[PDB]
Every structure is written in C-alpha cells, then in structure tokens.
Amino acid sequence: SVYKVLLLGAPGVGKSALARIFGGHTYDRSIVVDGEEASLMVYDIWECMAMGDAYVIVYSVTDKGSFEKASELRVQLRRARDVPIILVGNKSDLVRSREVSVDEGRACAVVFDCKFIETSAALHHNVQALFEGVVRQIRLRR
Ligand SMILES: Nc1nc2c(ncn2[C@@H]2O[C@H](COP(=O)(O)OP(=O)(O)NP(=O)(O)O)[C@@H](O)[C@H]2O)c(=O)[nH]1
C-alpha cells in the first residue's frame, strides 16, 4: 500500500517546501488517515513514464501565472490519461501580495474536478491536511 504522489506546478510556488515539510528528490513517510494507515511516497519531480497514484498541482496565491498554468496542467492531465488531482494554493501567509483569492481556487477546482486546499509552507498550515486528503482522495477513486 505505497501510494505514489507527484508534485507538479510552475517554478517558485513552493513544491520543494511542501515536500520537505511533509517528509522531514523523493520523500517517504507513513500517516494515519481515518483509523487507517497509509504510506505516501512524494516525488518532487522538477528537482518516468507516469506511475502516479495522485497528482498535486501547486500554484502560489501570490502568482496568477502559476494559477493559470495549473488549470492548463489540469486539462492536460485529463486529456492525456482516473487518478485524483489536488489543486494547491500555497503561500496563504503572504496576505498582501496575494493574486488569487480562495474562492477562485475552490470555484475552479470544483468545476475542473480537483480537490482544493490552500496551504502555507511557511506556517506549516494545511500541509498535514493536504497529504491526508491526497490519501482520502486516492481511496475515494479506489
Ligand atoms: N511566505 C511563504 N514563502 C513560501 C511558502 N512556500 C514556499 N515559499 C518560498 O518560496 C520560494 C520557493 O520555494 P520552493 O519550495 O523552492 O518552490 P519550488 O516550487 O520548489 N521551486 P522550484 O520549482 O524551482 O523547485 C522559497 O524562497 C520558499 O521559502 C509559503 O507558504 N509562504
């Protein structure tokens, strides 16, 4: 039961940051979601066919570019290849230089069939939740 999770997105959004947090390259760690264990391997790929159990697409809420690159990715993913996709708006802490609102993320995931969450790698906020929902989401689509 080793779920393989791919970390995708535009440059500088905070991918390597999210991987590192979650697993103290490729990142290993087992977690408990709903009474049930779970062994995630997280691939910070921008640091192989495509053998992914889930995709996390990260954008920064301070970078509209990264955000619209994310939709573009989401559509690509869907045309090419099923596997669950999680849409992540990282950097929720930079309240000031924010370019994408929460609602824009949610009301764009829902329509393009992603799980949405905002994280802040800098404040270890929702990084836990993110990788928990990744596990849950792989289970929702057996
Ligand atoms: N304030 C804040 N800064 C963040 C957050 N996450 C990442 N950063 C910062 O943004 C920069 C890019 O982080 P990084 O994780 O390297 O992004 P990346 O997506 O891996 N870049 P690359 O694709 O080049 O590997 C770093 O300076 C990092 O500290 C966050 O949640 N909040």
Swiss-Prot record:
Quaternary structure annotation from Swiss-Prot or TrEMBL: Interacts with calmodulin preferentially in the inactive, GDP-bound form. Binds CAMKII which is capable of phosphorylating RAD in vitro. Interacts with CAMK2D. Interacts with CACNB2; interaction may be involved in beta-adrenergic regulation of heart rate and contractile force. Interaction with CACNB2 regulates the trafficking of CACNA1C to the cell membrane.
Signal sequence, start to end: none
Organismal lineage: Eukaryota, Metazoa, Chordata, Craniata, Vertebrata
Highest taxon of source: Eukaryota
Induction of synthesis: Down-regulated in failing hearts.
Compartmental location: Cell membrane
Annotated TM spans: none
Residues of the full protein shown: 90 to 255 of 308
Summary of the tissues where the protein is detected: Most abundantly expressed in the heart. Also found in the skeletal muscle and lung. Lesser amounts in placenta and kidney. Also detected in adipose tissue. Overexpressed in muscle of type II diabetic humans.
Binding site for GTP: G9, A10, P11, G12, V13, G14, K15, S16, N90, K91, S92, D93
Function: May regulate basal voltage-dependent L-type Ca(2+) currents and be required for beta-adrenergic augmentation of Ca(2+) influx in cardiomyocytes, thereby regulating increases in heart rate and contractile force. May play an important role in cardiac antiarrhythmia via the strong suppression of voltage-gated L-type Ca(2+) currents. Regulates voltage-dependent L-type calcium channel subunit alpha-1C trafficking to the cell membrane. Inhibits cardiac hypertrophy through the calmodulin-dependent kinase II (CaMKII) pathway. Inhibits phosphorylation and activation of CAMK2D.
Protein's recorded name: GTP-binding protein RAD
Protein family per UniProt: Belongs to the small GTPase superfamily. RGK family.
